[PDB]
C-alpha cells in the first residue's frame, strides 16, 4: 500500500503527549490516536515488544490534518533509538536517523529545523516557530546568548550556572558557535526539561537554554510566572519545526502546501490555542 | 548569471540614484561598516540605479556562498505578484515578481516575498530568511482596537483603509469571506506601492494601511508621526523565490539555515532593522 505510511514521532508536551491505553478495550480514547512503542524484554536483548500507547498535541493533530488532506494512512510509532536526532560517528540516531535509514517516511514533531538535518532528509515548510531562547527567573538579567556572562562565564564571580538538555538542535548550536560557553555548560546539562526547571526553581542553576517553543510554553503555564525567557520571548537563531521527509520523498510538495493552507485559513491559530496558551 | 528581480522596499531594498558617473555613493552604517552597494537597472525604459539593504546584503551572502554571479533589476510593473484572470477566459496568469519568475525574466526573487500556498504552488520558496506579519498603520492618536474595530468592519468615505495593489494582502482580502466588506472598500483605495501608502498615511488623505509588520514596524521607528497596532492575522515569513527547475533550490535553503544558525540573519536585523 503506496498510500499507507510509517511515521515516527517522539514525546515532548505539548507537541507530543503520550498515554497509556486502557488496558481493558485496547483502544485509544477519542481525539488520540494509536501509537506503538517498542521495549525491550531485558538490556541484554533486541527481544522486545510492540506495546499500545496513545498520542496527542499539537503535533498529532497537525498529522490528522495532512492525514486527511493528503489522503494517506499511517502507523505511528515512538522512536526508541535517540530523541530528536543526533550525529555520531558519522550515523544519525533519533527521529532523523528513522528517516535517513528508511524505517519513517516522515517525522513528526517538535523537531528543528537545521543546515546539518536538512542535508540528508528534506524538511516541510515550518509549521511552528521557534529558536534558541532562554529560561531564567524573573529578576535576572541577561542581554542575550551573547552576554558576557555566557559567552566568558569565568569572568564573573561567582559565574553563572547555566545548561541545556544535550544531543539536539540547541546543544548543537552552542557547540558550532561558542566553543567555551559549550564546554563549560557541559556541567550543567540536564537530563530533561523537567528535570531544568527543578533545577531552576531550587537555585542549582541560573539560566536554562533550550527550544524557544517548548521554553514559552513552559513559561505560559509555571506556577505563579516565576520562570520567564528574556527579551519578550525572545529567539536566537529563528527557525521552526519542520516535518522531516526522505530526500526526494513523493510526499513533501503535497504536505507543504496543506501545512501552507492550514496557516493560510485559520487552522493552525485554533491549533496554538488549544494547545500552546499559557495564563502568564 | 542568475537574474535577479526586487522591489524598492525599505528596508530591505533602498533604490537611489547613481552619482554622475554611474557609480554608487560610499556609505557607511552607524557603526562604520560600508554600505555594499549593487548597479540594479529598472524603470522610470530602464536606468542603472543603486540597491542596497537586508535583502541585497543577503543576495550578496548567498552569491559569495554558493559561487554565481548575478544581474539585479527592479520588478517592470513595481508589483510584488498576484494571479489574475486573463481576457475574460478562465485561464489566469501572475503579474509582478512572481510573473517575472516563471516567464524567465528572472532566475530568482530576492525580496521581502510572502510565503503562501497560492504562490508555492507555481513557485519554489527558500526556508524563511524572516518571520513577521501583518499590521495597521495609522496616524499616532488614531486608536484602532484590531479587526473589529467600527471603522473597518462598517467602512464609510470617513476612515480610509487600503493595501498595495496586487500584492498578497490584496488578494487575501479579495478571497476570504469574512473580508467581503472590507475589500469593498479598499478596492476603491488600494496603492500602487507601499512607499505611497506609508506617505499618504503620514498626509492624512489614507487612514490605515495594511501591511508587512517587518516594514511596517520600521517606519514607525523612524517616524514617531506613525503607530502599528499588532499582529492582524496569522503569522507568515519571507522566503527567497526559485522556480521548480532552479538547480539552486537544495542550496539556497541551506545557506539560509546557516545565516540564522551562525548569527547572520540577526545581525542584518541590527544594521538595518532594529
Ligand atoms: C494574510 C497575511 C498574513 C500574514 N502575513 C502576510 C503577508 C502578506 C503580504 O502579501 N505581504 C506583502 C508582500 N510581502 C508580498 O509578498 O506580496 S499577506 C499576509
Ligand atoms: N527540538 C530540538 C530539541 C530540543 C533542543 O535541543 O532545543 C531538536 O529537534 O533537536
Given at each position: 500500500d503506496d498510500n499507507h505510511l510509517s511515521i515516527v514521532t517522539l514525546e515532548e508536551a505539548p507537541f507530543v503527549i503520550v498515554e497509556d491505553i486502557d488496558p481493558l478495550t485496547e483502544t485509544c480514547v477519542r481525539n488520540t490516536v494509536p501509537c506503538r512503542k517498542f521495549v525491550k524484554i531485558?538490556?541484554?536483548?533486541?527481544?522486545g515488544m510492540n506495546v499500545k500507547k496513545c498520542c496527542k498535541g499539537f503535533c498529532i493533530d497537525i498529522l490528522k490534518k495532512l492525514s486527511r488532506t493528503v489522503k494517506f494512512t499511517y502507523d505511528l510509532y515512538l522512536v526508541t533509538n535517540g530523541k530528536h536526532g543526533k550525529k555520531v560517528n558519522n550515523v544519525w540516531n533519533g527521529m532523523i536517523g528513522e528517516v535517513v535509514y528508511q524505517r519513517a517516511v516522515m517525522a513528526v514533531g517538535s523537531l528543528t529545523i537545521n543546515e546539518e538535518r536538512s542535508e540528508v532528509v528534506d524538511f516541510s515548510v515550518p509549521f511552528v516557530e521557534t529558536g534558541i531562547s532562554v529560561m531564567?527567573?524573573?529578576?535576572?538579567?541577561?542581554?542575550?546568548?551573547?552576554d558576557k556572562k555566557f559567552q566568558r562565564p569565568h569572568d564573573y564571580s561567582?559565574?553563572?550556572?547555566?545548561?541545556?538538555?544535550?544531543?539536539?538542535?540547541?546543544?548543537?548550536?552552542?557547540?558550532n558557535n561558542y566553543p567555551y560557553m559549550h564546554q563549560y555548560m557541559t556541567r550543567f546539562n540536564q537530563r530533561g526539561v523537567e528535570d531544568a526547571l527543578v533545577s531552576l526553581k531550587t537555585g542549582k542553576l541560573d539560566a536554562f537554554?533550550?527550544?524557544?517553543?517548548?521554553?514559552?510554553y513552559k513559561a505560559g503555564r509555571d506556577e505563579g510566572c516565576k520562570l520567564v525567557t528574556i527579551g519578550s520571548g525572545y529567539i536566537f537563531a529563528t527557525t521552526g519545526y519542520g516535518i522531516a521527509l526522505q530526500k526526494g520523498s513523493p510526499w513533501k510538495r503535497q504536505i507543504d502546501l496543506a501545512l501552507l493552507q492550514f496557516v493560510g485559513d485559520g487552522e493552525m491559530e485554533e491549533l496554538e490555542t488549544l494547545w500552546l496558551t499559557g495564563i502568564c | 548569471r542568475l537574474k535577479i528581480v526586487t522591489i524598492h522596499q525599505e528596508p530591505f531594498v533602498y533604490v537611489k540614484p547613481t552619482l554622475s558617473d554611474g557609480t554608487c555613493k560610499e556609505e557607511f552604517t552607524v557603526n562604520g561598516d560600508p554600505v555594499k552597494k549593487v548597479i540594479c537597472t529598472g524603470p522610470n525604459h530602464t536606468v542603472p540605479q543603486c540597491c542596497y539593504g537586508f535583502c541585497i546584503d543577503l543576495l550578496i551572502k548567498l552569491a559569495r556562498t554558493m559561487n554565481f554571479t548575478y544581474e539585479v533589476h527592479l520588478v517592470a510593473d513595481g508589483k510584488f505578484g498576484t494571479q489574475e484572470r486573463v481576457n475574460n477566459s478562465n485561464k489566469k496568469e501572475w503579474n509582478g515578481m512572481m510573473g517575472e519568475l516563471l516567464s524567465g525574466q528572472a532566475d530568482m526573487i530576492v525580496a521581502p516575498l510572502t510565503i503562501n500556498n497560492e504562490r508555492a504552488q507555481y513557485i519554489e520558496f527558500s526556508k524563511p530568511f524572516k518571520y513577521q506579519g501583518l499590521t495597521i498603520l495609522v496616524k499616532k492618536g488614531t486608536r484602532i482596537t484590531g479587526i473589529n474595530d467600527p471603522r473597518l468592519r462598517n467602512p464609510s468615505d470617513k476612515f480610509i483603509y487600503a493595501t498595495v495593489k496586487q500584492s498578497s494582502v490584496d488578494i487575501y482580502f479579495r478571497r476570504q469571506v469574512e473580508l467581503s466588506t472590507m475589500y469593498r472598500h479598499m478596492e476603491k483605495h488600494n496603492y500602487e506601492s507601499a512607499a505611497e501608502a506609508i506617505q499618504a498615511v503620514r498626509d492624512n488623505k489614507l487612514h490605515a494601511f495594511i501591511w508587512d509588520s517587518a516594514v511596517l514596524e520600521f517606519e514607525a521607528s523612524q517616524k514617531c508621526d506613525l503607530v502599528t497596532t499588532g499582529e492582524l492575522f496569522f503569522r507568515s515569513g519571507f522566503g527567497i523565490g526559485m522556480r521548480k527547475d532552479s538547480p539552486w533550490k537544495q542550496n539556497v535553503s541551506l545557506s539560509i539555515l546557516k545565516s540564522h544558525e551562525?548569527?547572520?540573519?540577526?545581525?542584518l536585523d541590527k544594521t538595518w532593522v532594529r
Open positions: 531485558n538490556n541484554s536483548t533486541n527481544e531564567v527567573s524573573r529578576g535576572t538579567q541577561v542581554t542575550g546568548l551573547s561567582p559565574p553563572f550556572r547555566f545548561g541545556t538538555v544535550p544531543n539536539g538542535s540547541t546543544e548543537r548550536n552552542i557547540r537554554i533550550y527550544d524557544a517553543a517548548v521554553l514559552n | 551562525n548569527g547572520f540573519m540577526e545581525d
